[PDB]
Design a protein around this motif. Structure first.
Motif, PDB file in Angstrom:
ATOM      1  N   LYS A   3      26.747  31.917   1.025  1.00 17.51           N
ATOM      2  CA  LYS A   3      26.651  32.993   0.043  1.00 17.51           C
ATOM      3  C   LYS A   3      26.486  32.416  -1.356  1.00 17.51           C
ATOM      4  O   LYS A   3      25.779  32.977  -2.198  1.00 17.51           O
ATOM      5  CB  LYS A   3      27.869  33.914   0.097  1.00 17.51           C
ATOM      6  N   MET A   7      23.181  33.358  -3.460  1.00 19.06           N
ATOM      7  CA  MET A   7      23.298  33.879  -4.820  1.00 19.06           C
ATOM      8  C   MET A   7      22.689  32.998  -5.900  1.00 19.06           C
ATOM      9  O   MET A   7      22.163  33.523  -6.886  1.00 19.06           O
ATOM     10  CB  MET A   7      24.730  34.218  -5.194  1.00 19.06           C
TER      11      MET A   7
ATOM     12  N   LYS B   5      32.179  34.116  -7.150  1.00 20.60           N
ATOM     13  CA  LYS B   5      32.396  35.170  -8.124  1.00 20.60           C
ATOM     14  C   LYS B   5      31.453  35.141  -9.313  1.00 20.60           C
ATOM     15  O   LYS B   5      30.747  36.142  -9.451  1.00 20.60           O
ATOM     16  CB  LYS B   5      33.854  35.286  -8.580  1.00 20.60           C
ATOM     17  N   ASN B   8      28.002  36.394  -8.368  1.00 12.62           N
ATOM     18  CA  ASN B   8      27.937  37.845  -8.133  1.00 12.62           C
ATOM     19  C   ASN B   8      27.855  38.545  -9.486  1.00 12.62           C
ATOM     20  O   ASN B   8      26.968  39.362  -9.740  1.00 12.62           O
ATOM     21  CB  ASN B   8      29.163  38.502  -7.469  1.00 12.62           C
ATOM     22  N   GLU B   9      28.796  38.153 -10.364  1.00 15.85           N
ATOM     23  CA  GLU B   9      28.876  38.648 -11.731  1.00 15.85           C
ATOM     24  C   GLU B   9      27.582  38.453 -12.506  1.00 15.85           C
ATOM     25  O   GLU B   9      27.024  39.420 -13.018  1.00 15.85           O
ATOM     26  CB  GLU B   9      29.977  37.944 -12.510  1.00 15.85           C
ATOM     27  N   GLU B  12      24.828  40.774 -11.469  1.00 20.13           N
ATOM     28  CA  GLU B  12      24.948  42.061 -12.153  1.00 20.13           C
ATOM     29  C   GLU B  12      24.391  42.094 -13.578  1.00 20.13           C
ATOM     30  O   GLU B  12      23.768  43.098 -13.928  1.00 20.13           O
ATOM     31  CB  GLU B  12      26.376  42.630 -12.144  1.00 20.13           C
TER      32      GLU B  12
END
Lengths: 48, 46
Positions: A3, A7, B5, B8-9, B12
């Motif tokens: 992941k 990402m 994290k 992901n942030e 956004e």
């Protein structure tokens, strides 16, 4: 770990999508400027 | 998970910049549309 890499990739893609869509946008900004001047100057020779 | 994290942030942040650019793109396609009209109507007397 997956992941994470997934990402990473998406980030590079979104960062570049920003550049791409703005070049599309810009071509329309340019056009919308020019088309306005061509509307105007035509009338600016037509007017009395 | 921290590495998970902030990615992901940041996605956004990025995805919303990109969301904006397409909404900004829409209205400009539409505006071009009507400007192109104003001309092609008007040239039908020249």
């Amino acid at each position: 770990e997956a992941k994470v890499k997934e990402m990473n990739e998406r980030l590079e893609d979104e960062e570049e999508m920003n550049a791409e869509l703005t070049a599309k946008k810009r071509k329309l900004e340019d056009e919308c400027s020019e088309l306005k001047r061509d509307i105007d100057d035509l009338e600016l020779t037509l007017a009395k």
